[PDB]
Structures are given as structure tokens and as C-alpha cells.
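Deliverable D2.4 — example input (C-alpha cells):
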């Protein structure tokens, strides 16, 4: 009724839903529609034929590989992180059991982009989709639950965590310093060269403020691939 206000649970999607707002999405949201990716031997035709099994060869390789931290993701138990003890004292050392899940997103590959020819999100999409694809397959194939009403819920939460890491608003950082500054260098050189096609510049780059709209335009593909 007339006491409607904002707590952003049902009308954030009405006001701040930046998903398909800007009609620069023809370059802001990416369709992986070029041939022979970074140097690994991808094939865009193959990819649009079947996006559901994108492979590492459709992005950087040699140094890029899901679970690039060669430590297998799902090995650890008894972990918590929010406020105060001697483990990681600064920030969120150990007092809320964040699922080891977020401690083991298969983003370790995506943290370590160095190779070039990525002047466009069209190529910056493929690695994000590798992250989503691998994290989804590992969370669904490795899940101790009895396949009851938990599995795709956890998969969706991993989706959202990946979404906010690509928006950078995550306040857990592992090698993410490398990853976050990597967005300040890869997402930068796909955002520091697309000067003509946008209007919201502000320094340093408003990194979060634009990768928010980028991921907002790129809703469908990442969700589809992670599912």
C-alpha cells in the first residue's frame, strides 16, 4: 500500500536493475562470436553450436586452467570466516562458516589472465564462462547431498558469488588481489579502449560501476553455462 519503501528485495529489480538498460549491450554483453580464441585453438562456430561444453581451449591456456591453484578445490572441512581470531586476523579470519565453496570457486584460472588479444569482452566472456562451467560441473558432480532440495540452490549461490566477484564487491580476497587488479588490467583494457562507445568514465575507472553494468548485460549466458 502507500507505505511502500526501499529495502531492495522486490523493487531493486524495478529501479536498480541495470541488466539490459544501456543499448550499448551489442558490445557490452558478449556473444562469443569470433574464431580461434586467444592462442589455444577455440572455435566460435563450435561454441555457438553448443555453449554447454565450452572448454579451456576457448580461452587462454598453458597457464590458464580451472583450479589453476593446483590444489583440488573440494578437500577441506571445518572452515569459518567473519570477524576475529588468529587465522587471518585482519578482516574475516575465522568466525562464520562461509562454505569452503566460496573458498573454492574455480576462479583460480580467471584470477591469472596475462595474455593479450583480449580487446573486447567477446573474449573476456569465454574465461568467465569457463569459470562458471567448471564450478557448476564440480559442484553438481561433487555434492554430498542426497540430490534433495539443495543441489541447484547451492549451484545458484555459487552463480551469485561468481557474479559479485566479476562485480568485485566480494570482501573475501585470496589471490584475488591479483584477480582484482587483473580486472584493473584485463577488464581495464576492455574498458580503457572502449572509450567512444560509452559515456560514464569517472576515475579511476569506476571499475565496479561499469563491470556492474557489464555483468548485468551478461546475465543470460553465464547463468546458462553454469547451469
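Example output (designed residues):
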Amino acid at each position: 500500500m502507500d507505505s511502500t519503501s526501499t529495502i531492495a528485495n522486490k523493487i531493486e529489480e524495478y529501479l536498480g536493475a541495470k541488466s539490459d538498460d544501456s543499448k550499448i549491450d551489442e558490445l557490452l554483453k558478449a556473444d562469443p562470436s569470433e574464431v580461434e580464441y586467444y592462442r589455444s585453438g577455440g572455435d566460435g562456430d563450435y561454441l555457438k553450436n553448443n555453449i554447454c561444453k565450452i572448454t579451456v581451449n576457448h580461452s587462454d591456456s598453458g597457464k590458464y586452467d580451472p583450479c589453476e591453484k593446483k590444489l583440488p578445490p573440494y578437500d577441506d572441512n571445518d572452515q569459518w570466516k567473519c570477524q576475529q581470531n588468529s587465522s587471518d586476523g585482519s578482516g574475516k579470519p575465522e568466525n562464520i562458516c562461509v562454505p569452503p565453496r566460496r573458498e573454492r570457486l574455480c576462479t583460480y584460472n580467471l584470477e591469472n589472465l596475462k595474455f593479450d588479444k583480449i580487446r573486447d569482452n567477446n573474449a573476456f566472456l569465454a574465461d568467465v564462462l569457463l569459470t562458471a562451467r567448471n564450478e557448476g560441473e564440480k559442484i553438481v558432480q561433487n555434492h554430498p547431498d542426497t540430490n534433495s532440495s539443495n543441489v541447484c540452490n547451492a549451484l545458484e549461490r555459487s552463480f551469485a558469488d561468481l557474479a559479485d566477484i566479476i562485480r568485485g564487491t566480494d570482501q573475501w580476497k585470496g589471490t584475488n588481489s591479483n584477480l582484482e587488479k587483473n580486472l584493473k588490467q584485463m577488464f581495464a583494457k576492455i574498458r580503457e579502449n572502449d572509450k567512444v562507445l560509452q559515456d560514464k568514465y569517472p576515475k579511476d575507472q569506476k571499475y565496479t560501476k561499469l563491470r556492474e553494468a557489464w555483468w548485468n548485460a551478461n546475465r543470460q549466458k553465464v547463468w546458462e553455462v553454469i547451469t
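The first helix runs from residue 12 to 15.
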